[PDB]
Amino acid sequence: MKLEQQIQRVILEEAKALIKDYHEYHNRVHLESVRNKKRLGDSAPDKKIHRPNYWSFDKKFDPFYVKSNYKSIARSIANKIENRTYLPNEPFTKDVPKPDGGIRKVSIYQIPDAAISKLFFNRLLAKNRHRFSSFSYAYRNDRNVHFAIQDISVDLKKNERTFLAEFDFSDFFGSISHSFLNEQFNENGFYISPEEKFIIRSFLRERKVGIPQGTSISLFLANLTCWKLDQDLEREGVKFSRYADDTIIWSQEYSKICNAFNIITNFSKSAGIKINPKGISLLTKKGLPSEITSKNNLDFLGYTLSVENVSIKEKSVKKIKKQISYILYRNLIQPLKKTSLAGQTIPANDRDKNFLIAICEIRRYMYGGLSKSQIKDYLSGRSNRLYFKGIMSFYPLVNDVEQLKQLDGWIVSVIYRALKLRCQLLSKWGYNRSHNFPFILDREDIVDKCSKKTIAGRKLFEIPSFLLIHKALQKGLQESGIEKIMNP
Amino acid sequence: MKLEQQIQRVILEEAKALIKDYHEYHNRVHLESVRNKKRLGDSAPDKKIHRPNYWSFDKKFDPFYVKSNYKSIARSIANKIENRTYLPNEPFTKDVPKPDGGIRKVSIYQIPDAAISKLFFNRLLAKNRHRFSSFSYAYRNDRNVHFAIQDISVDLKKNERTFLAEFDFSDFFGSISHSFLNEQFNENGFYISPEEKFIIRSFLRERKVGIPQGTSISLFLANLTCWKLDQDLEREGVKFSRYADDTIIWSQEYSKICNAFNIITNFSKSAGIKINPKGISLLTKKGLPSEITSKNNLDFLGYTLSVENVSIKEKSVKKIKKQISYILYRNLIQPLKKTSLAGQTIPANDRDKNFLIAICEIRRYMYGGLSKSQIKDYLSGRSNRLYFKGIMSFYPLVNDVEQLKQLDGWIVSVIYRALKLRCQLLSKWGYNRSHNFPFILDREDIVDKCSKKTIAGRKLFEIPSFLLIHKALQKGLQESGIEKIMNP
RNA sequence: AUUCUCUCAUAGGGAUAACGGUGUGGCCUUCUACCUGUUAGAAAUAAUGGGUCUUCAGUUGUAAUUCGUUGCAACUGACGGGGGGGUGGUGUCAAAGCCGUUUCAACCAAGUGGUAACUUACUUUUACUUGGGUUUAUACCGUGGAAAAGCCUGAGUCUAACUCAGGCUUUUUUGUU
RNA sequence: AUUCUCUCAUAGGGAUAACGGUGUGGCCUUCUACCUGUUAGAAAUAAUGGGUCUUCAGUUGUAAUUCGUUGCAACUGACGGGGGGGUGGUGUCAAAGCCGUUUCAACCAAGUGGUAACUUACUUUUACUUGGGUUUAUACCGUGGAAAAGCCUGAGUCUAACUCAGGCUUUUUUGUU
Structure with missing residues (x-):
């Protein structure tokens, strides 16, 4: 297997994946434009197929061009690597404002460069996995981060007290001396081949100071750079997880966390660049008090972890509510708030197509489109597999029944209120439908009525x-684990 | 995917693997009997195809019977699991004498029970991998134990003073209360499903006290019973590895190792059964002295690990020498020590077929059959892949050039001496061949002459x-890692 | 029968001789520096049959250098143990030493009180075979078929002896070849 | 051209209109309790069209029990928020409270100084769609072909005006369908 053939395969697969994503993009845009025409009548805006802007910044950001000449690109890239002259082209960088007031600098390399990065740095990560720490993730959406969450959750439940602290490694990775990185190349038993060292040094030479974040090379270079910090924190006995440019360190002892702070600074001085906490707190039971500055529950990647349970962060709950409310608004209010309702089917005959579309959109967003019979069949044993899609799939570890019960109530209440406003708007337009099915139900009846309603032999109105789906998620976690339910 | 179908697949695949192994066994026996006929002439023993004894102790130990009625076996096993009456049949148990003076009780379950054990306990180990420790292995031949070795090796090289201690958990797993095991079923975030709990309890009920060792269920149950010991040792800051019923705990601090001893004592008390050291020592540079009872190098699974290098254990070197010496003896002396040399080709015309067979046997044992051109192409870059088979494949981490150099000298010397004895014996039988090629070379010439010799255009005399192959192994470790060279 | 198929199936029924593999060589194709006859051929190469090195470290010169280092020469420094018995120099006031010269030893053995054996072997596991796939020959485990030999039992004539029937063991060819 | 093919190839040449996908439905097949018309049929079922629950906790009885627990009934305990404005009881010496009664609110909002909008959207990533595979219809991105309309430029007769040629933009049918 020659290197040129390997580069060919990698570049071609990356290009094909991007092409498939764009094809599905425009197909989705067309299907949605057809549905939106049906929804908003003549007011429906016209379709607008966009192509990513960075496709034009360089021709090699474009999947279609790279697929046009991936053989020549791979040929030249292999020759440049063999002659040790290869240097990656500049990536597209956009500065996104972090909510904490910082700046996250994304880097989108060109398809050839990204392909080479994946080919080599996935190999280096696989070859050196046992040298790296446990809970080290390059992205804050990585599916494996929930393992770290699980650990902290378990610890929080068991430990009488859990001291925690948080750190921002954003500036560390923005400006870390590449000479320090190079000093780590031959430490901690890392198996880095000479060609791999050339590719690492080439991607670093393309940069000037710091590691690119959110890239195929980010995880490996971070682990290689922070290997001594990880070793010192493990020798102290604290547990930690690095996700992107954030690090959480928790322990059962105050002295241990203090010494961890000391370790981070010894590492900061040795690296030439400082690491700053977001800082330190104690997590205890809700009833019991605290001696040091403390909070009842930590917020860790969309989870509010408490000593009593794991729940969804209020920001994430707000996002869920935003999506459900906008589903209902888009399908049941926005069309009736237009200047003309021409081409928009007005509900009649005890049938609202808009309400079915809205309930189904909410079902896709939440369950992934599952029927309550499917979920109950899984919960009973009748069926041995239930696909786990939707928003709850991203919160597999939630065990807060009260939060989910409150969100159930909120869904029912918002359905009632939006339907009432839809009736009011319809009546303004001159279509009395209050007595009809979708607008006559009281809130304390919606669920029941919709549970009984059936169309095509399938209960597609059930709220x-x-x-x-939480019951099902708990059963699926106890039967398959986290990794098997966050992707099928 | 129903449970009966899953059991069917597993039982059939296990039976087929065993059948394939037996077929290859008798084919090998025949090929070797043909070669041995050629070697020992009329004195050659006759073939004797054996079948494993345990195949007859129960019909389900026999792969062929299980393949005969694997459908009925799977049907009944699935029904028994669903009705929660399944109980594994007694395994075959032979008590082997451990060199330390102990006894290792191996357990060979029947093909159905082994298949079920794999089906469920591999799932459990995968689903709970992140809850387990790093260096936990169920066999002392597991390919991943070398990662643990690598870790300690790195530590030894970097640390001045590496306090080590060793522990025997043999009696712990021989008699651990199954109630303690059951108490751990709902701890450390372990995801164990109700059916998995039934299967664990069934395999335990089949036993009475302790965990079966050297089985598919050994690793998971050992991790589940020792999870709190692992957590305590990790909080202390010591690093440890459990291989089978052996545990090595190392640290850079004496206080940490002493506190680890205290932890093991407490865990022994909480389990109702004691854990005894083999005990506590300090590993330092060869030149520098020590305070406490100390040794220059620890012996860990075929490795003599020192602060200066990693070498092969003297017992393993003895084993290598035994195999090479017997290869030469069998092919060059034993045939000539028989009563009659009838049917045995006597060397003449400057060709010794026996010497070629012996050199090729040694090459298979050492290199795996590689040519020195293949190895030099890998070492140079001409060739990008060299399969790593033979004895050195089991010692991928050796970095002791002196030991390998001494073994090179020993190989050349033993070749010379065995050839000289072959010449002497041949001359007794009345066949003077001292002037001929295989009996004329001086020791300090063997290699050179054998290097230049060629047959079929390939140099199959090279010593x-x-x-x-150590050069090649080092390059392959730096290019592919441990996991990729211990199996292709 | 280890094949194929039925039984509310970790066990039992049937029906056919096949099923499952092994070494060699062939094509396919994965990667493989240089120099060469001699076959084709118009110097483009291919199959073939002979040969050479191919690694690591330092020094120095040179080019790049984001000051971690990197490409290229080209010079030497290693690149095949240990032990026993004699014997020469060294290399010192003696002597350890350590240079080399010859003999002994199949290994353990640089050791045991002593030293032979062993590979379908001993064993804490000391464990694996030649990049992936497929078909001309030589085969293999089991099962089936055929023949021969030996032994035992029973029946007919019956002093002997002969014939028939049943059972058991062993050895040879083949359909997979 | 995003197809196919050549150049010692991160770039350039050519040749053809195709390539790459999407929703629906069909078969294949993975797993799916019970009760039912009405179609086939001799009660063996299949496609169909309607309906019910299916989870968790405790108590008790019972069977196993390696004393961790496990199968089965069968009884209740939860199993769809919060807020604002009025209003009844409670439930106390007042009052917090907390039972229920009606209205308001599309969400954020249990809040902002104020409250609307928004899904190809905002964003630290807030990220995904209905078990696997394949073909009748409706399509999609790009490219190609055809037609129509508009604008600009140049040429001939030339006051006008007409004709031709080139370029640019937009909109419609199809070969993939």
Whole structure:
């Protein structure tokens, strides 16, 4: 297997994946434009197929061009690597404002460069996995981060007291001396081949100071750079997880966390660049008090972890509520708030197509489109597999029944209120439908009525419930684990 | 995917693997009997195809019977699991004498029970991998134990003073209360499903006290029973590895090792059964002295690990020498020590077929059959892949050039001496061949002459060298890692 | 029968001789520096049959250098143990030493009180075979078929002896070849 | 051209209109409790069209029990928020409270100084769609072909005006369908 053939395969697969994503993009845009025409009538805006802007910044950001000449690109890249002259082209960088007031600098390399990065740095990560720490993730959406969450959750539940602290490694990775990185190349038993060292040094030479964040090379270079920090924190006995440019360190002892702070600074001085906490707190039971500055629950990647349970962060709950409310608004209010309702089917005959579309959109967003019979069949044993899609799939570890029950109530209440406003708007337009099915139900009846309603032999009006899919998620976690339910 | 179908697949695959192994066994026996006929002439023993004894102790130990009625076996096993009456049949148990003076009780379950054990306990180990420790292995031949070795090796090289201690958990797993095991079923975030709990309890009920060792269920149950010991040792800051019923705990601090001893004592008390050391020592540079009872090098699974290098254990070197010496003896002396040399080709015309067979046997044992051109192409870059088979494949981490150089000298010397004895014996039988090629070379010439010799255009007289394949092993470790060279 | 198929199936029924593999060589194709006859051929190469090195470290010169280092020469420094018995120089006031010269030893053995054996072997596991796939020959485990030999039992004539029937063991060819 | 093919190839040449995908439905097949018309049929079922629950905790009885627990009934305990404005009881010496009664609110909002909008959207990533595979219809991105309309430029007769040629933009059908 020659290197040129390997580069060919990698570049071609990356290009094909991007092409497939764009094809599905424009197909989705067309299907949605057809549905939106049906929804907003003549007011429906016209389709607008966009192509990513960075496709034009360089021709090699474009999947279609790279697929046009991936053989020549791979040929030249292999020759440049063999002659040790290869240097990656500049990536597209956009500065996104971090909510904490910082700046996260994304880097989108060109398809050839990204392909080479994956080919080599996935190999280096696989070859050196046992030298790296446990809970080290390059992205804050990585599916494996929940393992770290699980650990902290378990610890929080068991430990009488859990001291925690947080750190921002953003500036560390923005400006870390590449000479320090190079000093780590032959330490901690890392198996880095000479050609791999050339590719690492080439991607670093393309940069000037710091490691590119959010890239195929980020995880490996971070682990290689922070290997001594990880070793010192493990020798102290604290547990830690690095996700992107954030690090959480928790322990059962105050002295241990203090010494961890000391370790981070010894590492900061040795690296030439400082690491600053977001800082330190104690997590205890809600009833019991604290001696040091403390909070009841930590917020860790969309989870509010407490000594009593794991729940969804209020920001994440707000996002869920935003999506559900906008589903209902888009399908049941926005069309009726236009200047003309021409081409928009007005509900009649005890049938609202808009309400079915909205309930189904909410069901897709939450369950992934599952029926309550499917979920109950999984919960009973009748069925041995239930696909776990939707928003709850991203919160597999939630065990807060009260939160999900409250969100159930909120879903029902918002359905009632939006339907009432839809009736009011319809009546303004001159279509009395209050007595009809979708607008006559009282709130304390919606669920029941919609549960009984059937169309095409399938109950497509049932109001989706977070608690049912939570039951299923708990069973699926106890039967398959986290990794098997966050992707099929 | 129903449970019966899953059991069917597993039982059939296990039976087929065993059948394939037996077929290859008798085919090998025949090929070797043909070669041995050629070697020992009329004195050659007759073939004797054996079948494993345990195949007859129960019909389900026999792969062929299980393949005969694997459908009925799977049907009944699935029904028994669903009705929660399944109980594994007694395994075959032979008590082997451990060199330390102990007894290792191996357990060979029947093909159905082994298949079920794999099906469920591999799932459990995968689903709970992140809850387990790093260096936990169920066999002392597991390919991943070398990662643990690598870790300690690195530590030894970097640390001045590496306090080590060793522990025997043999009696712990021989008699651990199954109630303690059951108490751990709902701890450390372990995801164990109800059916998995039934299967664990069934395999335990089949036993009475302790965990079966050397089985598919050994690793998981050992991790589940020792999870709190692992957590305590990790909080202390010591690093440890459990291989089978052996545990090595190392640290850079004496206080940490002493506190680890205290932890093991407490865990022994909480389990109702004691854990005894083999005990506590300090590993330092060869030149520098020590305070406490100390040794220059620890012996860990075929490795003599020192602060200066990693070498092969003297017992393992003895084993290598035994195999090479017997190869030469069998092919060059034993046939000539028989009563009659009838049917045995006597060397003449400057060709010794026996010497070629012996050199090729040694090459297979050492290199795996590689040519020195293949190894030099890998070492140079001409060739990008060299399969790593033979004895050195089991010692991928050796970096002791002196040991390999000494073994090179020993190979050349033993070749010379065995050839000289072959010449003497041949002359007794009345066949003077001292002037001929295989009996004329001086020791300090053997390699050179054998290097230049060629047959079929390929140099199959070259004396195999440990150091060349060590160069190749080092390059392959720096290019592919441990996991990729211990199995292709 | 280890094949194929039925039984509310970790066990039992049937029906056919096949099923499952092994070494060699062939094509396919994965990667492989240089120099060469001699076959084709118009110097483009291919199959073939002979040969050479190919690694690591330092020094120095040179080019790049984001000051971690990197490409190229080209010079030497290693690149095949240890032990026993004699014997020469060294190399010192003696002597350890350590240079080399010859003999002994199949290994353990640089050791045991002593030293032979062993590979379908001993064993804490000391464990694996030649990049992936497929078909001309030589085969293999089991099962089936055929023949021969030996032994035992029973029946007919019956002093002997002969014939028939049943059972058991062993050895040879083949359909997979 | 995003197809196919050549150049010692991160770039350039050519040749053809195709390539790459999407929703629906069909078969294949993975797993799916019970009760039912009405179609086939001799009660063996299949496609169909309607309906019910299916989870968790405790108590008790019972069977196993390696004393961790496990199968089965069968009884209740939860199993769809919060807020604002009025209003009844409670439930106390007042009052917090907390039972229920009606209205308001699309969400954020249990809040902002104020409250609307928004899904190809905002964003630290807030990220994904209905078990696997394949073909009748409706399509999609790009490219190609055809037609129509508009604008600009040049040429001939030339006051006008007409004709031709070139370029640019937009909109419609199809070969993939």
